[PDB]
Coordinates of C-alpha atoms and ligand atoms in Angstrom, one line a residue:
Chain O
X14 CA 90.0 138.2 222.3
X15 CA 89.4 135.3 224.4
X16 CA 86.4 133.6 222.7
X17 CA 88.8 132.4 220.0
X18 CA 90.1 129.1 220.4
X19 CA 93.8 129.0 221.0
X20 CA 96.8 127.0 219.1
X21 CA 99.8 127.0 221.6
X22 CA 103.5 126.1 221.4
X23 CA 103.9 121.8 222.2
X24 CA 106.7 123.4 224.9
X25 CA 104.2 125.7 226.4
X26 CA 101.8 122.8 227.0
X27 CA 100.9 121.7 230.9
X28 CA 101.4 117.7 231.6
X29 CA 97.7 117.7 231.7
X30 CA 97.0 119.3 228.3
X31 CA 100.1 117.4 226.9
X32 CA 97.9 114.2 228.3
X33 CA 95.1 115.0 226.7
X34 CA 96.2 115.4 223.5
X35 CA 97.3 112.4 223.3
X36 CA 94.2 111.3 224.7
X37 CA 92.2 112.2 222.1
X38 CA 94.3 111.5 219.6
X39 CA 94.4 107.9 220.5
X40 CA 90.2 108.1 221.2
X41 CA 90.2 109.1 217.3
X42 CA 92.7 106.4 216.3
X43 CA 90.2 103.6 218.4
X44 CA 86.8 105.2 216.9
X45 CA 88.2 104.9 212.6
X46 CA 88.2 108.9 213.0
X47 CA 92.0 108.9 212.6
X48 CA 92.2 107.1 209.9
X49 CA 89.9 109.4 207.7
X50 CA 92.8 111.7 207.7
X51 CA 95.5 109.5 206.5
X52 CA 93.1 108.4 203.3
X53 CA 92.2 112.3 202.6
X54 CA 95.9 113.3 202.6
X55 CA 97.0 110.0 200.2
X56 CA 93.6 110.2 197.8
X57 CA 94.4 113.9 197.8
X58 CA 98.3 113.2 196.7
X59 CA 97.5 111.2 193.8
X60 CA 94.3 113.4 192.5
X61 CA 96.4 115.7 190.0
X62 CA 95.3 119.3 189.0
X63 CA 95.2 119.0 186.3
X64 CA 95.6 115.2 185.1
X65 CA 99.3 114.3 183.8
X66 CA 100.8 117.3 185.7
X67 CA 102.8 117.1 189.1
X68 CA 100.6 119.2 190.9
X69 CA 98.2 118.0 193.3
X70 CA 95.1 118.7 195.3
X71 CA 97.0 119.5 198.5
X72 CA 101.3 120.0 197.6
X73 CA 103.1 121.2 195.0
X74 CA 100.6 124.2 194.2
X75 CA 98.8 127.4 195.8
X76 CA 96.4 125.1 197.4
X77 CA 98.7 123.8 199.7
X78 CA 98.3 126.1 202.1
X79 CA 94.0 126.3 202.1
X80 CA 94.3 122.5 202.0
X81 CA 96.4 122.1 204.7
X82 CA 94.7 124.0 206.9
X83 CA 90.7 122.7 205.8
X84 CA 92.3 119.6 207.0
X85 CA 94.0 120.8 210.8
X86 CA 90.3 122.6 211.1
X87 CA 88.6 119.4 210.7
X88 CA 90.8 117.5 212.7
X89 CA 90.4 119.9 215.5
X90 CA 86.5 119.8 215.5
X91 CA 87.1 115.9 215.8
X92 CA 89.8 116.0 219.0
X93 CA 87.0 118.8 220.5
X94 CA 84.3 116.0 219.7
X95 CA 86.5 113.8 222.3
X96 CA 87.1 116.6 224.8
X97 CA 86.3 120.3 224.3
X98 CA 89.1 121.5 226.5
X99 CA 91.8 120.8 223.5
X100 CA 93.0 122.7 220.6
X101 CA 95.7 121.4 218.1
X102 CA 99.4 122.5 219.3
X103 CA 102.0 123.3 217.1
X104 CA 105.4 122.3 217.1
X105 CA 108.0 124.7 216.8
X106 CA 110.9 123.2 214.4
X107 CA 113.0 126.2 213.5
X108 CA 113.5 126.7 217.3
X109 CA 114.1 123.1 217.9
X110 CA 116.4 123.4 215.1
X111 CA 118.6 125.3 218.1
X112 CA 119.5 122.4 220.3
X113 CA 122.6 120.3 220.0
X114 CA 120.7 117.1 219.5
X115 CA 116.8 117.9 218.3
X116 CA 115.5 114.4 219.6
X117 CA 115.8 115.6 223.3
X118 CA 113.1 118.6 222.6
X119 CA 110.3 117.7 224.8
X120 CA 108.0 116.9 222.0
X121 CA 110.1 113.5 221.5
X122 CA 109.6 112.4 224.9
X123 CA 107.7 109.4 226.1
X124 CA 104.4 111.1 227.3
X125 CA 103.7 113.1 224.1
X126 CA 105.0 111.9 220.6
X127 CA 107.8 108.9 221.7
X128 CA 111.5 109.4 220.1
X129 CA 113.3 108.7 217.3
X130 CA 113.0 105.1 215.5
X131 CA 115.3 102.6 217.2
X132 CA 118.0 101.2 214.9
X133 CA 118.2 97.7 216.0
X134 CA 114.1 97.3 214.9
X135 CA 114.8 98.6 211.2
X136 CA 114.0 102.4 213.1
X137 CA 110.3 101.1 214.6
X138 CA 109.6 104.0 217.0
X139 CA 109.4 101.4 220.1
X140 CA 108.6 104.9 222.8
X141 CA 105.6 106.6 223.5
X142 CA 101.8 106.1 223.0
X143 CA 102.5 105.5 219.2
X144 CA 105.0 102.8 219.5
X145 CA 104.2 99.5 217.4
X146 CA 101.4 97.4 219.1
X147 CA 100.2 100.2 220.6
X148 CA 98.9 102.2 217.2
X149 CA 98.2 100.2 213.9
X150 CA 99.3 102.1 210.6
X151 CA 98.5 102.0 206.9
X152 CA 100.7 101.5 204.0
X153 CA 100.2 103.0 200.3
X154 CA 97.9 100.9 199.4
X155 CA 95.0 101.8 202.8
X156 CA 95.7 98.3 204.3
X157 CA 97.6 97.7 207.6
X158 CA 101.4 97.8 207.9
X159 CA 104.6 97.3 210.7
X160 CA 104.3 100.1 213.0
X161 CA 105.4 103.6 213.1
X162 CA 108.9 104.5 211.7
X163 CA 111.1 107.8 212.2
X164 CA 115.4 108.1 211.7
X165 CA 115.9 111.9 212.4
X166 CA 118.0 113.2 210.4
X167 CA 119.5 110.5 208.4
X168 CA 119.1 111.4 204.4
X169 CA 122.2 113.6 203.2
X170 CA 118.9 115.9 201.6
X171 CA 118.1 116.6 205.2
X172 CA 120.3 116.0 208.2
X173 CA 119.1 119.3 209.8
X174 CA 115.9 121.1 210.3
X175 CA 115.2 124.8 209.2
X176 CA 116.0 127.5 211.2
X177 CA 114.8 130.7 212.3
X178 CA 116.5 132.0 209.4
X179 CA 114.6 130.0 206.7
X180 CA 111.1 131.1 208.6
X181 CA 112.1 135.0 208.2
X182 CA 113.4 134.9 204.9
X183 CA 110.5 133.6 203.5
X184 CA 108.3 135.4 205.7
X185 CA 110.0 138.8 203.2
X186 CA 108.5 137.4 199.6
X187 CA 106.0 139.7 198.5
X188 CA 103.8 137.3 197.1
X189 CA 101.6 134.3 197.9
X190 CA 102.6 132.5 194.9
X191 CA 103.0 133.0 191.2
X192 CA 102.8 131.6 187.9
X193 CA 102.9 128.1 186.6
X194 CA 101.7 127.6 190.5
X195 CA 104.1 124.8 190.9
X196 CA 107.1 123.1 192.0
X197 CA 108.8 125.8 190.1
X198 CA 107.4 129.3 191.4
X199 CA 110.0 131.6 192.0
X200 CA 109.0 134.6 194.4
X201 CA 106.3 132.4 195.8
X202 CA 105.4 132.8 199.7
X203 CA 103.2 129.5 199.1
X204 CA 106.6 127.6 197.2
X205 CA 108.8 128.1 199.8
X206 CA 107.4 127.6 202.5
X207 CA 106.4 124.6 200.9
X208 CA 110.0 124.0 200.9
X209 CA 110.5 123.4 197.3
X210 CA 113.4 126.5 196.7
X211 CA 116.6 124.9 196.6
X212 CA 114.9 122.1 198.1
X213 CA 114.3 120.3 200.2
X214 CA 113.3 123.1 202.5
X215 CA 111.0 124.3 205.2
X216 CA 108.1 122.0 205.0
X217 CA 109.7 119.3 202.8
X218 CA 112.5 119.7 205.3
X219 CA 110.5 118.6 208.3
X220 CA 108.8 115.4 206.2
X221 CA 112.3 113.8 205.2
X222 CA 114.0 115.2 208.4
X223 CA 111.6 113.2 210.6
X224 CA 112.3 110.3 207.8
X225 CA 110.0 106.9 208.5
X226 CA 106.3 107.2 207.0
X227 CA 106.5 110.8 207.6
X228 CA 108.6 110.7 205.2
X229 CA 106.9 110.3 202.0
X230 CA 103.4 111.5 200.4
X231 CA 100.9 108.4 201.0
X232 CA 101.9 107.8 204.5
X233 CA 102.9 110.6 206.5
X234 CA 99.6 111.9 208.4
X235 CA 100.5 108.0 210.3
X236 CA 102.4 110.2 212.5
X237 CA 100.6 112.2 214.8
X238 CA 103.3 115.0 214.5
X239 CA 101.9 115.5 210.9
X240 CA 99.3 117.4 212.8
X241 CA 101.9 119.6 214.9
X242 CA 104.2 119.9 212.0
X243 CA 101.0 121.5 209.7
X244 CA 100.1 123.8 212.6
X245 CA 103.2 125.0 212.5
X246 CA 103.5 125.7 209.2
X247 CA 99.6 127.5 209.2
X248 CA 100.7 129.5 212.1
X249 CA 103.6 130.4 209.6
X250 CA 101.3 131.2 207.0
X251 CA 98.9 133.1 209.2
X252 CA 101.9 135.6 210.2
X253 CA 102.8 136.0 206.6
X254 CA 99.0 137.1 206.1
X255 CA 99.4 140.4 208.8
X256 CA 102.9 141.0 207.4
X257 CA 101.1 141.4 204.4
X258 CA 97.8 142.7 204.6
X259 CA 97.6 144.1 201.0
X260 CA 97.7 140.7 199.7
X261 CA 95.6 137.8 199.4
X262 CA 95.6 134.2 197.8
X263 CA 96.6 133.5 193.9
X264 CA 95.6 132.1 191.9
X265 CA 92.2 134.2 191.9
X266 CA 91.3 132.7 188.1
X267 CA 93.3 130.9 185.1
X268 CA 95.0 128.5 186.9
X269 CA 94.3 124.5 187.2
X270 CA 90.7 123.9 188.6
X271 CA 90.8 123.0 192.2
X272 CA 93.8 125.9 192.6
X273 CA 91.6 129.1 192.4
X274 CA 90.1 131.1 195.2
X275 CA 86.9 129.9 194.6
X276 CA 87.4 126.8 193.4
X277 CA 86.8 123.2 195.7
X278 CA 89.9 121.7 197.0
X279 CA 89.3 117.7 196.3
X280 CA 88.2 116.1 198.3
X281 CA 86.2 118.7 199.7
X282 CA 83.9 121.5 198.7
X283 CA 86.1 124.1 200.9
X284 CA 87.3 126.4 198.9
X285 CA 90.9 128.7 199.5
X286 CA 88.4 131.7 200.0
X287 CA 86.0 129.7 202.7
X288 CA 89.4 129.4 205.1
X289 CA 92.0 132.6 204.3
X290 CA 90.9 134.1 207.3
X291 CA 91.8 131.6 210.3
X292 CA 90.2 133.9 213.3
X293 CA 86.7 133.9 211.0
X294 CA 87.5 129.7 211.6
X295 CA 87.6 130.2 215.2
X296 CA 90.9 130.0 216.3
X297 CA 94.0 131.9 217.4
X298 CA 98.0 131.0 217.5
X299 CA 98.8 131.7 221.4
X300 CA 101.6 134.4 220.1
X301 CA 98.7 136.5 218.3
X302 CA 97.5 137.7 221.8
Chain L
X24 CA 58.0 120.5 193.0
X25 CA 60.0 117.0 192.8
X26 CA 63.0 116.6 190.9
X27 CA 62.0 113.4 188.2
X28 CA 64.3 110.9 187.7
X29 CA 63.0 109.1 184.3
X30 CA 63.9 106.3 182.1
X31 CA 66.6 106.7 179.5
X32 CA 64.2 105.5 177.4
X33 CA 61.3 108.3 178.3
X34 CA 63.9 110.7 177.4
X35 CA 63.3 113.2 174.7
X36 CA 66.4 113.5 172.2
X37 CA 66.7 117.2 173.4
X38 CA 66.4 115.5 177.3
X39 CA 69.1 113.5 175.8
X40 CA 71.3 115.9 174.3
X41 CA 71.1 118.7 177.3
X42 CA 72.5 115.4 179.5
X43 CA 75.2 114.3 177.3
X44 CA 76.2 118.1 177.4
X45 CA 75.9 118.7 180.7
X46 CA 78.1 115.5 181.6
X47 CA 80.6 117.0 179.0
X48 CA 81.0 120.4 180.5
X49 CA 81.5 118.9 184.0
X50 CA 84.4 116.8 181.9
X51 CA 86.2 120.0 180.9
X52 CA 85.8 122.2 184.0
X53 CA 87.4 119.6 186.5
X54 CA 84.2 118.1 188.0
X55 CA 83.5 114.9 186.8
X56 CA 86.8 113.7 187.8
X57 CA 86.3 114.5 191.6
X58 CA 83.7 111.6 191.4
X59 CA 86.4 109.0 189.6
X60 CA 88.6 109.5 192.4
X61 CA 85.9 109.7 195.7
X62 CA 84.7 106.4 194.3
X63 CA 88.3 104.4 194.0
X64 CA 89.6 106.4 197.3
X65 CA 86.2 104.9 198.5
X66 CA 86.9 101.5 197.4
X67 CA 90.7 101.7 199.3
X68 CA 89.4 102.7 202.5
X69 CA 88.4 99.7 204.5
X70 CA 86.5 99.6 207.3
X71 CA 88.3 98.5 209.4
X72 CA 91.7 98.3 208.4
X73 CA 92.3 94.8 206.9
X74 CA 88.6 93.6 206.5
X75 CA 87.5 92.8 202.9
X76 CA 84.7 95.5 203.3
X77 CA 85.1 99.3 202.2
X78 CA 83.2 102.5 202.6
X79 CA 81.5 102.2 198.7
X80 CA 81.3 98.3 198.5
X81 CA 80.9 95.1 199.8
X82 CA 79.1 96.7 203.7
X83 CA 76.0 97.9 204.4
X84 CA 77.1 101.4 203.2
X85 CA 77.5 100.3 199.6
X86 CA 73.6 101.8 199.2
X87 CA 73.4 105.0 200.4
X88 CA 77.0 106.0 200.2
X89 CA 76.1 105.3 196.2
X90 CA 72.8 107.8 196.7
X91 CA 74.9 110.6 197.9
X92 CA 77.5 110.1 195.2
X93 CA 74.4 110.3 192.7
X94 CA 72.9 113.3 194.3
X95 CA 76.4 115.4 194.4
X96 CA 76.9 114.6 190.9
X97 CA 73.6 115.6 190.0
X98 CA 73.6 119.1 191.9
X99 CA 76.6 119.4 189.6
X100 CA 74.6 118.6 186.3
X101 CA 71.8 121.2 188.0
X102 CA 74.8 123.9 188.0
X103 CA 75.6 123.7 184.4
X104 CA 71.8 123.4 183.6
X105 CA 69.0 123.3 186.0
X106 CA 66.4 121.1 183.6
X107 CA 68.7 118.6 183.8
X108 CA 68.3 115.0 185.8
X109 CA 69.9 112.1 186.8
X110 CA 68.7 109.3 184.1
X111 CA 68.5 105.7 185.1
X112 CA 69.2 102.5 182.7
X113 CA 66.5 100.0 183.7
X114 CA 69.0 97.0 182.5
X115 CA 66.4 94.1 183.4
X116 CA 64.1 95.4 180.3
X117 CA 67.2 95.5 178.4
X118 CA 67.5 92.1 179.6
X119 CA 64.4 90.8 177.8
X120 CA 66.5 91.6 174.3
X121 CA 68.1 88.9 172.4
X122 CA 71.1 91.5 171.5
X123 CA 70.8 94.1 174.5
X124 CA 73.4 95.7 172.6
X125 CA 71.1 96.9 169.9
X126 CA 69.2 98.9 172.9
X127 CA 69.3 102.6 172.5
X128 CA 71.1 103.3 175.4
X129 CA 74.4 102.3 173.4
X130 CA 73.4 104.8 170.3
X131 CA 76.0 107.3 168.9
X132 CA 73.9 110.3 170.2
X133 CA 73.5 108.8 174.1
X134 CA 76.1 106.1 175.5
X135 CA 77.8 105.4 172.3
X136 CA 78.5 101.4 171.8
X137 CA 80.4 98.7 172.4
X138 CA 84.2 98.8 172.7
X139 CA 85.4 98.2 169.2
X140 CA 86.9 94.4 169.0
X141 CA 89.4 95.3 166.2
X142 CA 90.8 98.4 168.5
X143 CA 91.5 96.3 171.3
X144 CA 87.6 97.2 173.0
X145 CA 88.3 101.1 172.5
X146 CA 85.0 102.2 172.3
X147 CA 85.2 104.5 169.2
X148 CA 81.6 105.7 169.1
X149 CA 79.3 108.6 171.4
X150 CA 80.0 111.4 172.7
X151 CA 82.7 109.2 174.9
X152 CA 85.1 107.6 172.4
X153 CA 88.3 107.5 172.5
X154 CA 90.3 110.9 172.0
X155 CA 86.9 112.8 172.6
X156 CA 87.3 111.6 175.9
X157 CA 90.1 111.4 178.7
X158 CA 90.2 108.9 181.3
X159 CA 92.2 107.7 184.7
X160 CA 93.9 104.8 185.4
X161 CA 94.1 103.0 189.1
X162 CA 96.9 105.6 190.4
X163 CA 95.3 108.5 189.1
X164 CA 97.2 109.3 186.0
X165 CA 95.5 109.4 182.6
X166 CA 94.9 106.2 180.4
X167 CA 94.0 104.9 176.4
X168 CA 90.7 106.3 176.3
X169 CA 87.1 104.2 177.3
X170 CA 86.9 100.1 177.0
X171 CA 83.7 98.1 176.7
X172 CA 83.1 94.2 176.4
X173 CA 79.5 93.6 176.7
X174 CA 78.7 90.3 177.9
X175 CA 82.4 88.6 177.1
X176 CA 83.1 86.9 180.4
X177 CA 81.6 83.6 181.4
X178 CA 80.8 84.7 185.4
X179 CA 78.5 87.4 183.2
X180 CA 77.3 86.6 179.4
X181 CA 73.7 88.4 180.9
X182 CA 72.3 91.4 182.1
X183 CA 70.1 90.6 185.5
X184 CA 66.2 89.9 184.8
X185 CA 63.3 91.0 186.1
X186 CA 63.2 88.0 188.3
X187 CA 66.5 89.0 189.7
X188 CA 65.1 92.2 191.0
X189 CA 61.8 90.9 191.7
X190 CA 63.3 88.4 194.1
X191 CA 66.0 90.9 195.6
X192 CA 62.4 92.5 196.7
X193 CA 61.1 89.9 198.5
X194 CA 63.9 89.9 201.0
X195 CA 62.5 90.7 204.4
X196 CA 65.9 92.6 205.9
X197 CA 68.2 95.2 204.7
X198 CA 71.5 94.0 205.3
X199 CA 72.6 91.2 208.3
X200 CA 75.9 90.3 210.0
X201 CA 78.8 90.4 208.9
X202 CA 77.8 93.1 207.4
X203 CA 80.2 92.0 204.1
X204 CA 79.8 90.3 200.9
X205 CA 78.6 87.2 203.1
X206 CA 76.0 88.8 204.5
X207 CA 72.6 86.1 203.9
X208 CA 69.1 87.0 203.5
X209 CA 70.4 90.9 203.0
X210 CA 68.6 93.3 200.7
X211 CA 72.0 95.2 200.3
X212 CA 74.4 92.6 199.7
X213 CA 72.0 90.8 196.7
X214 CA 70.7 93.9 195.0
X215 CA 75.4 94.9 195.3
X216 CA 75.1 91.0 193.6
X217 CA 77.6 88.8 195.8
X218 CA 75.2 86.2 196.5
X219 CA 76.0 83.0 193.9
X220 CA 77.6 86.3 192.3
X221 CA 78.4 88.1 190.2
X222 CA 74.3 89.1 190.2
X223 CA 72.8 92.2 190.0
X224 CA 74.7 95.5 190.7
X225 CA 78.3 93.8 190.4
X226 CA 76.8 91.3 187.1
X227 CA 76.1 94.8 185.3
X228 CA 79.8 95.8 185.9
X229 CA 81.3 92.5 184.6
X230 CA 78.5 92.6 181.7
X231 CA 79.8 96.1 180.4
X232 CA 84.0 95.3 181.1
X233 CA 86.7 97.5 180.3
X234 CA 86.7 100.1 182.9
X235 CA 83.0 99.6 184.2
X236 CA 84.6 96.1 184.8
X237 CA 87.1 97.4 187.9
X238 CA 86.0 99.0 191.0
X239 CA 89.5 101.8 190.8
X240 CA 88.2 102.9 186.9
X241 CA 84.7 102.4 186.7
X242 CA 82.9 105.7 186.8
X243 CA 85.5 106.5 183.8
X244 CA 82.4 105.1 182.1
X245 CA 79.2 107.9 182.7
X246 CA 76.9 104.4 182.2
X247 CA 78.6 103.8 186.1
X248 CA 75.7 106.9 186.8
X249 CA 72.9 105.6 185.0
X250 CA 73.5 101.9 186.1
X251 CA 73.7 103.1 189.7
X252 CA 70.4 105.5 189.7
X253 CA 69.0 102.5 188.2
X254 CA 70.2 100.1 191.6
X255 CA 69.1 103.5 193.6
X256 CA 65.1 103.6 192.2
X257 CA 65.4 99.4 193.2
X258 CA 66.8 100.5 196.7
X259 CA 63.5 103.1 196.8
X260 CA 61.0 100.2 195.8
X261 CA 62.2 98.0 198.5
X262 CA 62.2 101.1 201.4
X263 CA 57.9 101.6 200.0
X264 CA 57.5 97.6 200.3
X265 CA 59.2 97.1 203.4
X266 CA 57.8 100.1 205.8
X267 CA 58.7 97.4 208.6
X268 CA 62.2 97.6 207.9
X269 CA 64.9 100.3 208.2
X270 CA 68.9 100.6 207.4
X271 CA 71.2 98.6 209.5
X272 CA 73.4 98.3 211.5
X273 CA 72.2 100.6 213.6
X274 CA 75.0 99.8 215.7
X275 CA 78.0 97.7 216.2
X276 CA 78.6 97.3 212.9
X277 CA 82.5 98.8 211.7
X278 CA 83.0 102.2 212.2
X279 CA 81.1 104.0 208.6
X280 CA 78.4 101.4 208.3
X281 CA 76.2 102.1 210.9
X282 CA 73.0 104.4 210.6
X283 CA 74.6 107.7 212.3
X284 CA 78.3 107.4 211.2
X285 CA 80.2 109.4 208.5
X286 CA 80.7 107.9 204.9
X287 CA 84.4 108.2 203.6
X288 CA 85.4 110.5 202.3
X289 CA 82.4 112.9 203.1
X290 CA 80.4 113.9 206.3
X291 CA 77.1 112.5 205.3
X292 CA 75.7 109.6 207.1
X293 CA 73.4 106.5 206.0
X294 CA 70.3 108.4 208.6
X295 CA 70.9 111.8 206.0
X296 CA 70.2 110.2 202.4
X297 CA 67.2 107.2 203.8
X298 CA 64.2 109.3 202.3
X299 CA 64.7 110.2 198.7
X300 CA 61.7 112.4 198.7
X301 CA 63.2 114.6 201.1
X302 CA 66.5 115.1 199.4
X303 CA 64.6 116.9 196.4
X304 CA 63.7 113.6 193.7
X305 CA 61.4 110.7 192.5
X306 CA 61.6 108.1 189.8
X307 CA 58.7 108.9 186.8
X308 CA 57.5 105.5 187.8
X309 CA 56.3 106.6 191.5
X310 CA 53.9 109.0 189.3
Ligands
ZN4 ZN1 100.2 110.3 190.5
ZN5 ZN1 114.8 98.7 206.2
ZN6 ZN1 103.2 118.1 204.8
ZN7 ZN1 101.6 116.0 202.6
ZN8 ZN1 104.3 143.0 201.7
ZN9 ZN1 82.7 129.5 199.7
ZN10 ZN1 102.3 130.0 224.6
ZN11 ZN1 57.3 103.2 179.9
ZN12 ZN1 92.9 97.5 200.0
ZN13 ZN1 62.3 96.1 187.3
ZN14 ZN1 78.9 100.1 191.2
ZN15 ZN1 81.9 100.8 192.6
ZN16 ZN1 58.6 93.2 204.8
ZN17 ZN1 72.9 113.7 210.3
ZN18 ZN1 58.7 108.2 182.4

């Protein structure tokens, strides 16, 4: 009950654990862990399930989820590596998603993640301890690029991010996902939060909300708020799991390999089953307690 | 109580066929393409960012980050059938041919031959021709089928020779600073083949073309695992005749070259995969 490691809110953060966040984060960046994560998310994007198809490892299938969070847990073990006392936080869009202008939430602010991309520098984030010069990024390709860049809110696909709303609603489906566990599932718990209904939603929401290498598959995990973004989204997924305790994962068998429950998720050996029950991982969401 | 590693050649024909089966199965169930893409996410990841070196090639890693790719892929074969080993394809014998493509290695029941010049190099023979097997181009997405071009550039017209190897032995040190393709009087960077290249490891690529050719395609080619248990048993050799020596860097080399750090994309460090014996195999030859 207190053994459990615990994931809190960004807002509910002390300036000290805020600090050392960052510290770590930036330790990992300096050390090559960081950039471990960037190639596991892109090599995972572009290994499809099966070949040919639009699914991949880690979106736009029932993976997603399991994927997602193998990677947070591994990222995690790396910040506590650096310093023990931290846990990933989570950032909380759909409250965010409130406020008149969403780039004065704390999160944005120059001690934690630095604000929106500035105009005048083709939307370089020149704030915070990720401004250009200060952290080195990679493009598609794994070779070294411009800076970080983020323009909140700027495609007509995405000028808003979800609400409250959005969460619930999809919090209601009755199902994790379903058949062709894709793009397309309708009903799916695992689709929609994805963001893919009437998309882009939710998840996908968030990505092109935040706009710059965020914005797009190869590059996004550039951005540190990748991390608070997918913790978000696994606290999400973890409520959906006590809502609805007579479910589990699908597909359990006959869908593309490295989507079953039992199957490896590329490019690990973790399978969905090794990771479907977060407090058997370790770790707690702060509003659990 | 060891795992044997043998000689394609020492192989029995059943040996031969419970391989080429097991290699197939791993095909059809997803497997075998978790290795394409490890090894050409491997080859993108530079270390660091910028530098010429990667986490597969061209650094000190290039050795042992190849030994744990073998042994995963042969805990795989074990899965689909236990009596099954990683072969190797001693290609300095092959060498000694005046045709090495006349070696059984290329026959219809093992490898299958060389690409097909009236088909554009399609190899259209083995168990691996063309439309009996898939493959991936450099983004992932699938491609024409399996290319071959034995011997057709001028940088390689020749397999290495025993001399090659021989002399690779000699060398007193595992790998030296820079720790890259540069690297002098290194163990690691003449046995990967980039001194007065293309030699050795990287003159066995160029030899075979088509996808073997290409660091993003070339374990589309399941010669890439016989060719590299092949450099592996040469890596072993030199660790029994230099007892002196040991991996390096030990340290301040980049970050996932030196002894104790991770190997992109998996956990396992240079320190884990050093002593063959104790991760479960020999080569017939240390009998
Ligand atoms: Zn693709
Ligand atoms: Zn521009
Ligand atoms: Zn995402
Ligand atoms: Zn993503
Ligand atoms: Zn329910
Ligand atoms: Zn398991
Ligand atoms: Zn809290
Ligand atoms: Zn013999
Ligand atoms: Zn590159
Ligand atoms: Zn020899
Ligand atoms: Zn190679
Ligand atoms: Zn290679
Ligand atoms: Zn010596
Ligand atoms: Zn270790
Ligand atoms: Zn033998």
């Amino acid at each position: 009950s207190n053994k459990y490691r615990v994931r809190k809110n960004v807002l509910h953060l002390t300036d000290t654990e805020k600090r050392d966040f960052i510290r770590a984060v930036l330790i990992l960046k300096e050390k090559g862990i960081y950039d471990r994560y960037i190639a596991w998310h892109g090599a995972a994007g572009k290994f499809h399930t099966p070949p040919g198809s639009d699914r991949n490892a880690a979106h736009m299938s029932s993976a997603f989820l399991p994927w997602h969070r193998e990677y947070l847990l591994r990222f995690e073990r790396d910040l506590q590596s650096v310093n023990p006392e931290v846990t990933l936080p989570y950032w909380e869009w759909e409250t965010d998603a409130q406020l008149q202008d969403p780039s004065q939430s704390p999160i944005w602010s120059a001690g934690f993640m630095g604000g929106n991309g500035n105009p005048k520098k083709d939307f370089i984030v020149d704030t915070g301890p990720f401004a250009a010069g200060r952290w080195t990024t990679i493009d598609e390709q794994g070779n070294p690029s411009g800076g970080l860049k983020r323009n909140f809110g700027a495609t007509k696909e995405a000028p808003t991010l979800p609400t409250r709303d959005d969460v619930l609603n999809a919090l209601k489906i009755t199902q994790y996902d379903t058949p062709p566990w894709d793009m397309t599932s309708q009903n799916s718990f695992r689709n929609q939060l994805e963001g893919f209904i009437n998309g882009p939603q939710l998840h996908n929401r968030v990505h092109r909300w935040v706009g710059g290498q965020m914005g797009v598959v190869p590059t996004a995990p550039n951005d540190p708020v990748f991390f608070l973004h997918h913790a978000n989204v696994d606290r999400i997924w973890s409520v959906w799991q006590i809502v609805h305790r007579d479910q589990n994962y699908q597909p359990m068998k006959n869908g593309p390999f490295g989507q079953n429950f039992r199957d490896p998720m590329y490019p690990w050996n973790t399978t969905p089953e090794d990771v479907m029950n977060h407090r058997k991982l370790g770790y707690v969401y702060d509003i659990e307690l």
